[PDB]
Amino acid sequence: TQRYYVERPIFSHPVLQERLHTKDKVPDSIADKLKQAFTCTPKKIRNIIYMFLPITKWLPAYKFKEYVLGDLVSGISTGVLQLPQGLAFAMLAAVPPIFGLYSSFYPVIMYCFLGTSRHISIGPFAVISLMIGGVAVRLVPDDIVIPGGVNATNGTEARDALRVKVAMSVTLLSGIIQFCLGVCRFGFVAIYLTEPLVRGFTTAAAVHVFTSMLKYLFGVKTKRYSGIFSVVYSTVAVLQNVKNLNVCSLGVGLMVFGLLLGGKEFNERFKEKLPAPIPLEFFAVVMGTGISAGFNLKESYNVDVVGTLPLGLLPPANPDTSLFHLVYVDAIAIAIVGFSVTISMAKTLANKHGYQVDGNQELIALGLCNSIGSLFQTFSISCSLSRSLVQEGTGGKTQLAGCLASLMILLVILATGFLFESLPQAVLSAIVIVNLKGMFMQFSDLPFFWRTSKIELTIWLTTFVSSLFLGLDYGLITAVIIALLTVIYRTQSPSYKVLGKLPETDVYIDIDAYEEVKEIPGIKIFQINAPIYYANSDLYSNALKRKTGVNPAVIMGARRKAMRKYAKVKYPPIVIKSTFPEEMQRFMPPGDNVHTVILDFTQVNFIDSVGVKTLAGIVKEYGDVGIYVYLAGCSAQVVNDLTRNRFFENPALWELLFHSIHDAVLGSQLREALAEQEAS
């Protein structure tokens, strides 16, 4: 083994700078930087196409023998859940369920072309559907007057058509906003969605879905709520009118709920013995339709059912832009929430599978999906969190599984929709609630973060509470800001350490940590692992004066008290020699006799104007009582901050900067030795 051997002079800043000559920066002109960015080599255009059409990259690289079985199983398992979720979330959007089926077909196909994630399930989302239904009923209330040429027994078809128009308009506007944000590179903000924040946000979204499904589980009529405390209002309303529940709807839904839970437990426990998981949503739906049609519950027990599902696809139709001025705010909110839900879950799966997702491409894909789908009578979509978990956890590899699920939805739309007309809405509710279980499993993060980082546990809990009680829009921005403020908290509560020296080395460690490091007599070394900006500087100065035990104000007060008791451009030197008489020093209380204070700046990333003022004050106050202050390990950035401020207006302070703590200690000891040499 070799050894660490260093033999060099003491490196103060002027001494080290004498050995360094400034290098010539290579010319980097902006005009040439733009010119070299427009070469348009074929590889560059191929990379651009891959960026904007990801299917052009991962489809030719499809490992058929390694991906086809997993994609097929995942596609079937995703489709059997996609159908009831589409119907239920269409109900949440105040539109006929067939439009939820449309929203489960076109955007998934488009996302298979434009999307970057290969595990999320694109489709209707409960929170987005709730927002769409809110704007739809605000623009088209239940007591609206329509001169549609019908008798007093109105079938509510015209009201449904008007609400569909409103939903398509808001969907087109939200898609336009999402596409514009993706073009303007707004997706960079996805970097501010940390893992605890994402998981707390998604758990809160799952609670939102569960709350939105309660009225359909119980069969009660409840006013629509959207905004702050909407989850609380919805739960309160459902519990308030729970006395008017449909007992048959609740019984059927609870039977489906229990059977689904049992089947999911069976699948999980026998995963190793089952070649593929049994699709239980298909059996749940079919059995439900059998029970409702066979006993004819729809009017026998007034059980709410899915209703008529017209067959066939609709021709493209232009949404009316005339409603934009009435919906744009909602369109903005839906755009934001849709992005936040899509990029969160995507990240959650990408980190699980060792790849990365482009936020800008996610925004572009969402915008194109929503805007083009609005032409095909599709309301605003997002990522379905529970269905994304199902798709990922059933062996899903690429987005071809989503294409297979969309093919199943298309089969329902074209030929077999009429078979589900008697399916009870309660059954749909139960299915959704059951599939929320995996989402709720994320609560297991609370102990884990409690063991790993209480700051990140705070981020998790704050994000959960915010996204729950406020909306998924206001709660998300609140959580992002608070998570960023945790960094300010970290800087405002740093580790203030007094350093001692490991004998016969140059290693300086916390004096209260290892029992072998010893403080150097006459020298105090103070260290902060944080910047010294405005929110920090006063705490840093107080901590220095408290932890080192060297308070210049206390020293001055003791000097004055001892004096009273014994009674019965040019710059002055920074350190004023203590002209304290020895006769008065006889009454001076004993102390540590510290002549130098070393400030360890190795971990100080930056210093602002307020921090520079604090540092100058520290130097002046300590020099007034005849104590030297040295800065050790100042980075080039910190030295530049000191120079941009008026810290080195007196050039003498250049002598206070040393390369390392050992350099400063050796320089201080050398200064003391020279002072003793010239004393006598």
Ligand X SMILES: CC(C)CCC[C@@H](C)[C@H]1CC[C@H]2[C@@H]3CC=C4C[C@@H](O)CC[C@]4(C)[C@H]3CC[C@]12C
Footprint of Cl ion (CB under 5 A)? 209, 384-386
Which of the choices ligand CCCCCCCCCCCC, ligand X, ligand C14, none does residue 576 contact, using the CB cut-off of 5 to 8 A by kind? Answer: none
* CB count in 10 Å sphere of residue 432: 26
Q: Is 507 in the site for a second copy (CB under 8 A)?
A: yes
Question: Segment 294-313, which members bind ligand HP6 (CB under 6 A)?
Answer: 295
* CB count in 10 Å sphere of residue 96: 23
Mark residues 235-254: x for contact with ligand HP6 by CB under 6 A, - for none.
xx--x--------x--xx--
386 annotated ligand binder? yes
Please say which residue, 179 or 647, places its beta carbon nearer to ligand CCCCCCCCCCCC: 179
Mark residues 17-56: x for contact with a second copy by CB under 8 A, - for none.
--xxxxxxx-------------------------------
Please say which residue, 194 or 384, places its beta carbon nearer to ligand C14: 194
Beta bridge partners of 496: 528
Question: Segment 419-448, which members bind ligand X (CB under 6 A)?
Answer: none
d(CA 496, CA 510): 9
Among the candidate windows 173-181, 613-621, 637-645, 661-669, which touches ligand CCCCCCCCCCCC by CB under 6 A?
A: 173-181
> Which of 249, 244, 248 is CA-nearest to residue 213?
249
Mark residues 80-119: x for contact with ligand CCCCCCCCCC by CB under 6 A, - for none.
-----------------------------x----------
> Which of 677, 631, 624 is CA-nearest to residue 655?
631
Coil, helix or strand for 423? coil
| Matching residue, tokens 């970290």 | 490
Of 16, 146, 162, 255, the one binding ligand CCCCCCCC (CB under 6 A) is 255
User: What one-letter code names the amino acid at 555?
Assistant: I
* CB count in 10 Å sphere of residue 461: 15
Beta bridge partners of 501: 508, 518
Of 267, 453, 486, 492, the one binding ligand CCCCCCCCCC (CB under 6 A) is 492
In the numeric block, which tokens belong to residue 565? 């008791």
Instruction: Please answer whether residues 133 and 91 qualify as being in contact, where contact means their C-beta atoms are separated by less than 8 angstroms.
Output: no
Q: How many residues bind ligand CCCCCCCCCCCC (CB under 6 A)?
A: 14
Which of the choices ligand X, Cl ion, ligand C14, none does residue 462 contact, using the CB cut-off of 5 to 8 A by kind? Answer: ligand C14
Q: Is 670 in the site for a second copy (CB under 8 A)?
A: yes
DSSP labels, 437-466: HHHHGGGGHHHHHHHH-HHHHHHHHHHHHH
User: Which whole-number Å values give the CA distances from 412 to 77, 483, 603, in the listed order?
Assistant: 15, 44, 63
| Matching residue, tokens 């969402």 | 366
Q: 545-560 b/e with 16+ CB inside 10 Å = b?
A: bebbebbbeebeebbe
* CB count in 10 Å sphere of residue 568: 5
Class of residue 207 by CB neighbours under 10 A (exposed 0-12, middle 13-18, buried 19+): middle
DSSP labels, 231-281: HHHHHHHHHHGGGG--HHHHHHHHHHHHHHHHHHHHHHHTTTT-SS---HH
Please say which residue, 6 or 31, places its beta carbon nearer to ligand C14: 31
When CB distances to ligand CCCCCCCC are compared, the closest residue is: 290
Mark residues 60-89: x for contact with ligand CCCCCCCC by CB under 6 A, - for none.
x-xxxx---x---x--xx-xx--x------
Q: List the alpha helices (DSSP H) in 93-156.
A: 97-103, 106-114, 126-139
Q: Which residues are annotated as a binding site for salicylate?
A: 386
Q: Name the site residues for ligand C14 (rule: CB under 6 A).
A: 453-455, 457-458, 461-462, 465, 482, 485-486, 489
Q: Name the site residues for ligand HP6 (rule: CB under 6 A).
A: 207, 231-232, 235-236, 239, 248, 251-252, 255, 295
Q: Name the site residues for ligand CCCCCCCCCCCC (rule: CB under 6 A).
A: 176-177, 179-180, 316, 318, 321, 324-325, 328, 332, 371-372, 375
Q: Which residues are annotated as a binding site?
A: 386
Q: Name the site residues for ligand CCCCCCCC (rule: CB under 6 A).
A: 53, 55-56, 59-60, 62-65, 69, 73, 76-77, 79-80, 83, 113, 189, 192, 247, 250-251, 254-263, 265-266, 274-280, 282-284, 287, 290-291, 294-295, 408, 411-412, 416, 462, 465-466, 469-470, 480, 485, 488-489
